[PDB]
Nucleic acid binder design. Structure first.
Length: 177
RNA sequence: UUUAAACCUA
């Protein structure tokens, strides 16, 4: 059990060269946004149970136009993960790796004109999990304010969310299957 | 009926 994660001085975590490093694994070098060039994480906030259930069944997600370019750019450069969060309750729904690039023609039936295109995903965990620290992370993910759908999060936010999801599921808390 | 990845592994 490592001590609580805090971003008040997260920018102060530096290696000997002066590069920003992760607070969770100091070997991971970050840019000045706290993002790892190798592993990148975006939040998908969603209240549509039809969409979420379709996504967990068919391993497809519709990407918003307002975040599609940054996600498409990240996919060509890094491993890219979506962490799915219920928009009103902040329950974690799971997380998945993006495994194909944006595609304007391959959109799920539930997508609308706010979406740019479809991506295939590979679910890593699925859940329906309430965790107070997950909810706190999502609540502060936009410079201390609530997450915006599709935004990229810092490496330590993504990694801690994956850890928290894995831990609960292993404790048989918050499973969906 | 759910080994996160990566990094590091004497």
């Amino acid at each position: 059990t490592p001590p609580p994660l805090n971003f008040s001085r997260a920018s102060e975590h530096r290696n000997e060269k002066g590069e920003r490093i992760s607070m969770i694994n100091p070997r991971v070098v970050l840019d000045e946004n706290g993002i790892s060039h190798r592993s990148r994480y975006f939040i998908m906030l969603c209240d549509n149970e039809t969409a979420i259930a379709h996504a967990k069944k068919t391993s497809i997600w519709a990407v918003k136009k307002d975040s599609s370019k940054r996600i498409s750019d990240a996919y060509k450069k890094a491993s890219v993960y979506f962490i799915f969060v219920a928009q009103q309750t902040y329950n974690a729904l799971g997380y998945a790796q993006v495994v194909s690039d944006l595609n304007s023609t391959e959109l799920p039936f539930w997508s609308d004109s706010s979406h740019a295109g479809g991506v295939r995903i590979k679910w890593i965990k699925t859940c329906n999990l309430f965790s107070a620290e997950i909810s706190e992370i999502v609540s502060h993910m936009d410079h201390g304010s609530e997450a915006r759908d599709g935004m990229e999060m810092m490496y330590d936010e993504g990694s801690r969310l994956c850890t928290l999801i894995n831990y609960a599921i292993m404790k048989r808390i918050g499973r969906d299957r």
